[PDB]
Design a protein around this ligand. Structure first.
Ligand SMILES: *[C@@H]1O[C@H](CO)[C@@H](O)[C@H](O)[C@H]1NC(C)=O
Ligand SMILES: *[C@@H]1O[C@H](CO)[C@@H](O)[C@H](O)[C@H]1NC(C)=O
Ligand SMILES: *[C@@H]1O[C@H](CO)[C@@H](O)[C@H](O)[C@H]1NC(C)=O
Ligand SMILES: *[C@@H]1O[C@H](CO)[C@@H](O)[C@H](O)[C@H]1NC(C)=O
Lengths: 509, 102
């Protein structure tokens, strides 16, 4: 589409050579700054070489500006169950004289338990004593050694993805297109490197917007059913039992199994209960829908309306009413990149065909320009009031661009030049005025609002008071005279009617 | 729905095994406890509770006193029974709006 906010920060900053025989370049390095733009615009970065007449540009596309948070840590919390078993034996020797562990023996496995498995998981090797008598199983009124082992299992295999975060910094999406032809997308952060791709390190800056009631919130998501919910989650390994933050593990594939070497649990997560050689285990782990302040996918806590935006690397968003933030300018840094230049530009000449759009407003005024040349794309339009750059194709085609004007009757003479050749163009048409749209029920904001032009807010005597009757060349005086005569006639008629009414009301009472 | 409670802050479900007698009274916590209320010498399990020997029984300190005048070394009792602490209810309990039955 169209483009605006040119920079031209590091023009003529190359140290190339003949260029592989005919014309080539090596690298261009510098630093520039891109101001804030409305959602659905393009910021072009036009380079200039001392030898070549013109060069290509670098367009920056922004679609949505959502309120997301950073990624402090990532883990998976699987669901667990209650599994336990025991065994009843007799002393029958000197191994169980008084107690089972003499001083510190915790290995309560006599090469018989099922703990030596890959699906067993985490547990605690506990033990207790027994009783004596014919009903207790032995022939000695003395405590008998009775071992017990408990663990946790996961038959279903439901996997959860929790990511604690407490920053909630503004962010947006960027659809960057390299001058070579490659088009990729990435999500920049407010101060975090965005995985620089071939030198370009364009980052986004915010305004540090405060939150109303966002203190302990996370972005726990489900994988199988793709269900999202907002609930306060735990912190890193050093945690407390009582809320979310139960037995975790290393990775996602290691979450189906609760085995050791990757799974982390502090203490007191499964209880043991036994009366007479039973060793029954009760469940104490709370599910995700058990803590307080458990929200759902649609959340309207405070002024923010947290929706579920389909996007990679993040599924949490939200957009309040029109905010009109202060600034959202970017910062672009270069490290290394190549760009080929033709420097074989020939005669090119275009003209204006149509013109339409709003007044000085958000969408602006779109103007269609038709060109014809042999070169692929060598053009740079420059005029007063606004500057717009775009790309063309080989042959004769039609293109639509948008410019910013500050006058209803657009009748000027702009200069158009493609590559090295220059010409003159003219624009003539009628424009209209559109204000900021109003809010309607049933509609919710999706990403954000950038800015609305509400500066003048005053009627202009030039545009107004004209289209009611017309406009010739020197008939304005006659029109004013006719307006005055009609006004005087209507005044006399109204006065006569009022006098007749007063005369009728006074007499004949 | 996470229903709140009126006066249920420190309550337990201590039960008796022989006579099957139930009562509601504030009990202690895990091994790290304080002497003065319920929470006397415990052990591992019920079948191991008949004996007060080591390897399962846990006591912190100061649960039995010693007194001697002339080669006597007499011992006095300080352990309190279950019916000695305050707020000791019975099977029928009507504390607040809740009527705790069995
Ligand atoms: C739930 O939110 C309320 C209000 O923000 C807060 O007072 C309360 O402590 C929260 N609950 C938990 C368990 O954090
Ligand atoms: C220019 O003429 C009218 C004016 O609005 C427009 O509808 C038309 O599509 C334009 N011509 C071309 C070839 O696009
Ligand atoms: C111009 O574009 C055509 C098709 O897009 C391509 O085949 C050709 O190589 C391009 N020429 C230059 C000089 O980029
Ligand atoms: C008994 O209950 C009352 C009222 O809840 C309380 O003030 C008092 O401290 C309790 N006594 C003990 C020993 O906990």
């Amino acid at each position: 589409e169209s483009c605006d906010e040119m920079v031209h920060a590091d023009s003529k900053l190359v140290s190339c050579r003949q260029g592989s025989g005919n014309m080539k370049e090596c690298v261009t390095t510098g630093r520039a700054l891109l101001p804030a733009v409305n959602p659905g615009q393009e910021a072009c970065l036009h380079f200039t070489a001392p030898g070549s007449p013109d060069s290509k540009c670098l367009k920056i596309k922004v679609k949505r500006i959502n309120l997301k948070c950073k990624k402090s840590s990532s883990y998976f919390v699987p669901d667990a169950r209650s599994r336990c078993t025991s065994v009843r034996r007799c002393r029958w020797a000197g191994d169980c004289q008084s107690g089972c562990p003499p001083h510190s023996t915790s290995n309560s496995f006599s090469d018989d338990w099922a703990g030596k498995m890959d699906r067993a998981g985490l547990g605690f090797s506990g033990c207790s004593d027994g009783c004596g008598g014919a009903a207790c199983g032995c022939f000695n009124a003395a405590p008998s050694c009775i071992f017990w082992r408990k663990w946790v299992e996961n038959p279903h295999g439901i996997i959860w993805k929790v990511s604690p975060c407490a920053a909630w910094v503004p962010s947006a999406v960027i659809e960057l297109t390299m001058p070579s032809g490659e088009v990729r997308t990435f999500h920049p952060m407010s101060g975090i490197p965005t995985q620089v791709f071939k030198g370009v390190s364009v980052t986004y800056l915010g305004s540090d917007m405060e939150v109303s009631g966002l203190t302990d919130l996370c972005e726990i998501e489900e994988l199988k059913s793709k269900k999202l919910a907002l609930a306060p989650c735990n912190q890193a390994g050093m945690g407390v039992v009582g809320k979310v933050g139960e037995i975790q593990c290393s990775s996602e594939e290691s979450a189906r199994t609760i085995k050791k070497d990757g799974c982390i649990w502090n203490a007191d997560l499964v209880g043991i209960e036994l009366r007479v050689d039973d060793a029954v285990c009760y469940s104490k782990i709370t599910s995700v829908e058990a803590v307080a302040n458990y929200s759902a996918i649609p959340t309207t806590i405070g002024g923010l309306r947290f929706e579920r935006s389909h996007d990679s690397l993040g599924k949490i968003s939200g957009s309040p009413l029109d905010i009109t933030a202060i600034r959202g300018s970017f910062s672009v840094n270069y490290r290394g990149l190549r760009l080929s230049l033709s420097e074989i530009t020939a005669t090119c000449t275009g003209e204006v065909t149509n013109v339409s759009g709003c007044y000085s407003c958000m969408t602006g005024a779109k103007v269609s320009i038709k060109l014809h040349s042999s070169k692929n794309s060598t053009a740079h339009v420059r005029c007063k009031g606004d500057e717009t750059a775009f790309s063309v194709l080989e042959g004769v085609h039609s293109y639509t661009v948008s410019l910013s004007f500050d006058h209803a009757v657009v009748d000027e003479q702009c200069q158009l030049n493609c590559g090295g050749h220059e010409s003159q163009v003219t624009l003539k048409g009628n424009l209209i005025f559109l204000d900021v749209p109003k809010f309607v029920d049933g509609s919710y904001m999706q990403t954000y609002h950038s800015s609305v032009p509400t500066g003048a807010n005053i009627p202009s005597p030039t545009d107004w008071l004209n289209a009611l009757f017309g406009n010739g060349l020197s008939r304005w005086i006659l029109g004013v005279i006719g307006v005055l005569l009609g006004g005087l006639a209507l005044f006399f008629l109204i006065m006569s009617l009022f006098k007749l009414g007063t005369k009728q009301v006074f007499r004949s009472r």
